[PDB]
Amino acid sequence: LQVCLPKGPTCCSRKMEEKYQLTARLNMEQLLQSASMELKFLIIQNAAVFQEAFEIVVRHAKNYTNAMFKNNYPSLTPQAFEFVGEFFTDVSLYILGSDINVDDMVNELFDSLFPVIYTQLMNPGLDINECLRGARRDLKVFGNFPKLIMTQVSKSLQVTRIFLQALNLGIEVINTTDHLKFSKDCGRMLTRMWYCSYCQGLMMVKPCGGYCNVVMQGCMAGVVEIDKYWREYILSLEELVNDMENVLLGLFSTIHDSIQYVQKNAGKLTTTIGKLCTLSSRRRELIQKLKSFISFYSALPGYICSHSPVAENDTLCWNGQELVERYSQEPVVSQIIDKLKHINQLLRTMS
Amino acid sequence: LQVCLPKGPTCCSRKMEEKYQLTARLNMEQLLQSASMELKFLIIQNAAVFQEAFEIVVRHAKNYTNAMFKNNYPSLTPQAFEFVGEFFTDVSLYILGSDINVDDMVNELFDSLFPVIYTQLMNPGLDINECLRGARRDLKVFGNFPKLIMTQVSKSLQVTRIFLQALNLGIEVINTTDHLKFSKDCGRMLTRMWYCSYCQGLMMVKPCGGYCNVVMQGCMAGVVEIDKYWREYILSLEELVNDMENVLLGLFSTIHDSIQYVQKNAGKLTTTIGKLCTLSSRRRELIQKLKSFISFYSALPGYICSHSPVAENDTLCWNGQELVERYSQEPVVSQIIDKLKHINQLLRTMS
Amino acid sequence: SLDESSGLKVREVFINVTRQQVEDFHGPEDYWCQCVAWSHLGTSKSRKASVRIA
Amino acid sequence: YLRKNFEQDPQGREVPIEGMIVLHCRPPEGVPAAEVEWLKNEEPIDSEQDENIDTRADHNLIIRQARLSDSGNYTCMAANIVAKRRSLSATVVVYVNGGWSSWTEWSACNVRCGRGWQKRSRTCTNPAPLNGGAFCEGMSVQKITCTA
Ligand SMILES: *[C@@H]1O[C@H](CO)[C@@H](O[C@@H]2O[C@H](CO)[C@@H](O[C@@H]3O[C@H](CO)[C@@H](O)[C@H](O[C@H]4O[C@H](CO)[C@@H](O)[C@H](O)[C@@H]4O)[C@@H]3O)[C@H](O)[C@H]2NC(C)=O)[C@H](O)[C@H]1NC(C)=O
Ligand SMILES: *[C@@H]1O[C@H](CO)[C@@H](O)[C@H](O)[C@H]1NC(C)=O
Ligand SMILES: *[C@@H]1O[C@H](CO)[C@@H](O)[C@H](O)[C@H]1NC(C)=O
Ligand SMILES: *[C@@H]1O[C@H](CO)[C@@H](O)[C@H](O)[C@H]1NC(C)=O
Ligand SMILES: *[C@@H]1O[C@H](CO)[C@@H](O)[C@H](O)[C@H]1NC(C)=O
Ligand SMILES: *[C@@H]1O[C@H](CO)[C@@H](O)[C@H](O)[C@H]1NC(C)=O
Ligand SMILES: *[C@H]1O[C@H](CO)[C@@H](O)[C@H](O)[C@@H]1O
Ligand SMILES: *[C@H]1O[C@H](CO)[C@@H](O)[C@H](O)[C@@H]1O
């Protein structure tokens, strides 16, 4: 045999030994799954909820601005509908991790807004449109509203995007936990601890508690090292939470005030242009329930040994090769560490 | 046989036919070499001469500037010798086609000149040297002398480098001419025209002039197409000739005036820095002798037929398969065309 | 309508559908529509035309 | 004599978490031969410190996995008895592509009698986008009508 140390006779061959190894693998994976399931479900729930909530906020702000345009500036419709839809589509896209520039969003928005204002509100009476687009930027007709909107929405959308990425990365690492494959020696030790007693003809003998402790410390060597990075991740997320909704809702008020500011100088503008041309409660509850799992990677070997059939009394137990009266006594992990380091640096540099 | 059309008996086998083919190849290569030798040697001579003349001009300007520093600014020597040598070495390198930036040459020159001026002319009394180098550019101490020198030398060095490149490319195309390999059918036709008469037992029969004309027009099909581009190359070179020496000679006058300009503001500069820290005849003769070769690619088949044993009388001559009393009647080329187009566009955009 | 080639009852139905309907539709597939015609013998489905926002 | 212009500056690259990238560097012409040294974010890198990074005789920086050596501004610097010359820094950013999760279980029909709903979630976490990786393509939620 190659796993069960044959002290004398044996009831199992090499094939039954491979079978015991596969069952040991399945049992270890099931135990890790049972340990991680509650936290995994919590983070998956919150990720889904916040993504849906942000999409709802974007849609609400979108057709609120649409309604305000429809009520106060009917001469600017339906062009206003088109460029407002474009802007809020780009906003939702930037929220979902796409490569979008916020300042460029605001600039395209105002470059689309100004010509229809000039043609339908100031000079009622098309192909010179690009010249007007240029006059939007060259005369700074909207004053400091564009820079104000740029900063206001950029701050909130960036923190929101980083928050969603952090939630997804937490889901990913916790899901990789129960799929962690260990070394061959660790597998042979788990097989010896759980099943090699059956090869010797024993029916109800359980492994020693101290033997389980040493086996798990040998197996989970690299896995415990994830604890520091997981704690720093939880703390950085708590720092980041202590808003995207307020900015996207006040966008229409700011745009209406900007239109009024532009209209206040129409006398000289038309002449010179003709001449030239519970959410906060959900984040707080998530953080409070997540702080209870800061010791997830430190209590995992204890969980594996306490939730498996063990002889805690260390009397008449299986030490891995014989029945004794008293026991005498990285790559995937590195991937998890690197992803945690990245998300922690992002959370640190944000707040 | 596969080349000599056997009208009846024949004195040669297939092996003697391959021998005649190889001798035809050697004869064609020798004829092309004899046709191209004069132009090739002319352009090689002029290329060598102009390169040597430019190197002489660079050395003369070099030690002219050296003498002016030694006579007018002895306190700046021997550092002046070092950076003047560096500058003129880089000048010679850029002249010979190397990837050298002229603006960087002038900037390094002035960055080396300013600290020794500050330490030996303005503040008589080393490791803070880079700070002084920075103050050269941050305070714009040399005024507009650097941009003036940059433009003045960039124009002349660029036209000189392009002139040398055009000469070298002419050498390259004329040398590629005599190595042109032709098609199998062209080779068989040359073998039939020059040697297949021997297979029939004839001793002194020469091929018909019109037969030579049709054979050469079939062979030199793509080679004649080079005539337009070669003529345009000659004309563009003549346009470019109608200077590098004058600029490199006036360099010392400009550098001395720049030093005087710098010294005129020493009062505030020292305080703020201490607180902070025949040739034209040769081109004309080359162009005049080169214009005599503007019909080189158009008169080449005529040369091949007139410098080979032919029956210009069209009486009792070899038509390729029998003795008659009266005759009845690309890739490498594309490479040459592309290089000629490029050099012609450069010569056009220069002058 | 009545067809010229054959004297039989023809029916033509038009359905508008606004941009607001497509942009506010949050289904899994592209906004598609199908046509069902009813006869004395049975029913028949047509092609699924998907109206999308460019 | 040492030249200012580098023969070939390192090029910035985008590489996945598992991808391998080689940074080429040709020092400027000079006598003696320039000693090429790699600097990650203006700080030298030790080839013996990590198995993932190694220095080649022809001045090349090879990275097998983007895990043991993450993103940064890699710069090639040539040293000689004359002076030193810095090349243009290459912005190497490691990007992670979005990857779909398996279909969860169908939820119970909210309505006891009549038209009900059944949901199935599909998160973007295997793998989750990193350092500005492209987000998962398609829908995240699945809803079907049920009759109880
Ligand atoms: C958490 O970890 C578990 C364990 O690793 C993981 O379960 C796995 O899910 C993936 C989903 O991608 C399964 O892989 C699939 O296998 C099927 C059948 O062969 C393929 O059709 C799938 O291919 C799709 O994606 C490919 C990506 O390259 C495409 O090439 C292809 O065209 C398809 O689009 C896919 O490879 C895998 O089998 C399971 N593992 C087991 C043992 O069942 C789970 O995804 C992880 N994440 C979460 C949050 O659950
Ligand atoms: C926007 O919401 C208003 C109510 O505030 C509603 O009347 C209108 O139909 C909605 N329009 C769109 C485009 O959804
Ligand atoms: C063994 O069992 C006894 C029962 O009273 C208990 O007191 C003791 O703590 C047990 N040993 C260990 C190692 O837990
Ligand atoms: C050129 O260099 C020589 C070095 O022997 C020097 O004597 C001479 O003065 C320099 N040039 C001129 C033209 O004076
Ligand atoms: C041409 O041929 C005739 C004989 O047929 C001869 O007399 C005459 O000299 C020849 N002339 C030339 C120039 O070939
Ligand atoms: C990388 O270097 C370039 C200059 O080479 C600089 O513009 C850029 O900001 C640097 N990026 C980082 C992340 O340091
Ligand atoms: C998820 O989407 C599809 C499956 O429909 C694939 O392109 C790929 O598996 C992706 O991650
Ligand atoms: C869920 O949907 C189907 C299974 O019904 C597959 O395409 C795939 O497993 C997906 O995740």
Cα–Cα dist A90/B274, whole Å = 54
Instruction: Please name which ligand lies nearest the alpha carbon of B85.
Output: 4
Q: Which long-range contacts (CB under 8 A, 24 or more apart) does C4-10 make?
A: none
**How far apart, in whole angstroms, are the C-alpha atoms of residue D132 and residue D138?**
18
Around Cβ B246, how many Cβ atoms within 10 Å? 12
Q: Closest residue of C to D120, CA-based?
A: C28
Alpha-carbon gap, residue B321 to B15, rounded angstroms: 19
Q: How far apart are the first and last CA of chain D?
A: 87
Contact present, B114 and B262 (Cβ < 8 Å)? yes
Nearest C-alpha in D relative to C29: D139
Cβ–Cβ < 8 Å for B110, B142: yes
Question: What's this structure's resolution in Å?
Answer: 4.1
Distance (Å, rounded) from C-alpha A158 to C-alpha A38? 29
Whether residue D49 lies within 8 A of chain B, CB to CB, comes out as no
Q: Give strand pairing partners of D39.
A: D44, D75
Tokens 């986008």 locate to D129
Quick one: tokens of A212?
């389980």
Chains near B (3 or more Cβ pairs under 8 Å)? D
Neighbours of B205 (CB within 10 A): 15
Q: Residue D32, preceding bond cis, omega within 30 degrees?
A: yes
**For the CA of D126, the nearest ligand:** 1
d(CA A309, CA A220): 19
Q: How is residue C32 annotated by DSSP?
A: E
A165 neighbors D130 (Cβ within 8 angstroms): yes
Per-residue CA distances from B102 to A232, B68, B91, B93, B251 (Å): 54, 22, 8, 11, 14
Q: By what technique were these coordinates determined? A: X-ray
CB environment B84-101: b (16+ within 10 A), e (fewer): beebbebbbbbbeeeebe
| Residue with CA at minimum distance from ligand 4 atom 10 | B63
Ligand 8, residue D100: give the atom nearest the CA. Answer: 11
In angstroms, what is the span from residue C16 Cα to ligand 1's centroid?
42
The alpha carbon dihedral of A49, A55, A59, A64 has a sign of positive
**A12: nearest Cα among A260, A164, A169, A200:** A200
Note whether C11 and C46 are within 8 A (CB). Answer: no
CA-based nearest residue to B333, from B167, B184, B216, B219: B219
Measured in whole angstroms, how far is the alpha carbon of residue B80 from the centre of its chain? Answer: 34
- The token duo for A3 is 């796993």
d(CA A28, CA A34): 10
d(CA D86, CA D24) in angstroms, rounded, equals 14
Q: After which residues are there C–N gaps above 2.5 Å in chain B?
A: 125, 242, 277, 329
* Residue with token string 């004359």: D82
Atom 1 of ligand 3, residue of closest alpha carbon: A313
Query: In the beta sheet, which residues pair with residue D85?
Result: D78
Give me ligand 5 centre to Cα B313, in Å: 6
Cβ–Cβ < 8 Å for B303, B193: no
Q: DSSP assignment, residue A125?
A: -
A59: Cβ contacts below 8 Å, ≥ 6 apart: A88
For residue C28, give the 3-state DSSP assignment. coil
What phi and psi, each to the nearest 5 degrees, are found at residue A207?
-70, 150
| Ligand 4 centroid – CA B63 distance (Å) | 7
DSSP, res C44? E
Query: For atom 1 of ligand 8, which residue has the closest CA?
Result: D103
- In angstroms, the separation between the Cα of residue D127 and the nearest Cα of chain B is 46
CA atoms of D75 and A71, how far apart (whole Å): 57
Q: Is D130 close to A44, i.e. CB distance below 8 A?
A: no
CA A240 – CA A110 distance, rounded (Å): 32
Q: Which residues pair with D92 in a beta bridge?
A: D72
Q: How far apart are CA D135 and CA D75, in angstroms?
A: 30
User: What lines the ligand 5 site, CB under 6 Å?
Assistant: B 312-313, 315
Give every CB contact of residue A97 below 8 A, 6+ residues apart in sequence.
Answer: A161, A164, A165, D98, D129, D132, D133, D134, D135
State the nearest Cα–Cα gap between D87 and chain A, in angstroms. 28
Q: Give, as one character, the DSSP assignment of residue A296.
A: T
Q: Which chains touch D (3 or more CB pairs under 8 A)?
A: A, B, C
**Which residues does a 6 A CB cutoff place in the pocket of ligand 6?**
D 73, 88-89, 91
In SS3 terms, A298-323 reads as: CCHHHHHHHCCCCECCCCCEECCCCE
Q: Does C28 touch chain D (CB under 8 A)?
A: yes
- Please state whether beta strands D14-15 and D90-94 pair in parallel, antiparallel, or not at all (unpaired): parallel
- D14-15 vs C49-50, strand pairing mode: unpaired
**Quick one: C17 exposed, middle or buried, by C-beta within 10 A (0-12, 13-18, 19+)?**
exposed
User: Tokens 């038509």 — which residue?
Assistant: B319
Ligand 1 center–CA D102 separation, angstroms: 7
Residues of C in contact with D119 (CB under 8 A): none
Task: Give the Cα separation of D31 and D80 in Å (integer).
Answer: 8
Which strand (E) or helix (H) includes residue D116? strand D115-121
Cβ(A307)–Cβ(A197) below 8 Å: no
Kindly list the residues from chain D whose CB atom is less than 8 angstroms away from the CB atom of residue C30: none
Q: Where are the beta strands (DSSP E) in chain A?
A: 317-318, 323-324
Kind plus residue range of the DSSP H or E element containing A190: helix A184-194
- Matching residue, tokens 């006579």: B71
For residue A122, the number of C-alpha atoms closer than 13 Å in the C-beta half-sphere is 23
Q: Among D96, D100, D103, D122, which is best to mutate for testing ligand 7, by the most ligand atoms less than 8 A from CB?
A: D100
Yes or no, beta carbons of D5 and B100 under 8 Å apart: yes
Is the C-alpha dihedral spanning D141, D142, D146, D148 positive or negative?
A: negative
Atom of ligand 6 nearest to the CA of D91: 1
Distance in angstroms (rounded) separating the CA atoms of residues B271 and D91: 41
HEC assignment per residue over chain B: CCCCCCCCCCCCCHHHHHHHHHHHHHHHHHHHHHHHHHHHHHHHHHHHHHHHHHHHHHHHHHHHHHHHHHHHCHHHCCHHHHHHHHHHHHHHHHHCCCCCCHHHHHHHHHHHHHHHHHHHHHCCCCCCHHHHHHHHHHCCCCCCHHHHHHHHHHHHHHHHHHHHHHHHHHHHHHHHHCCCCCCHHHHHHHHHHHCHHHHCCCCCCCEEHHHHHHHHHHHCHHHHCHHHHHHHHHHHHHHHHCCHHHHHHHHHHHHHHHHHHHHCCHHHHHHHHHHHCCHHHHHHHHHHHHHCCCCCCCCHHHHHHHCCCCECCCCCEECCCCEECCCCCCHHHHHHHHHHHHHHHHHHHHC
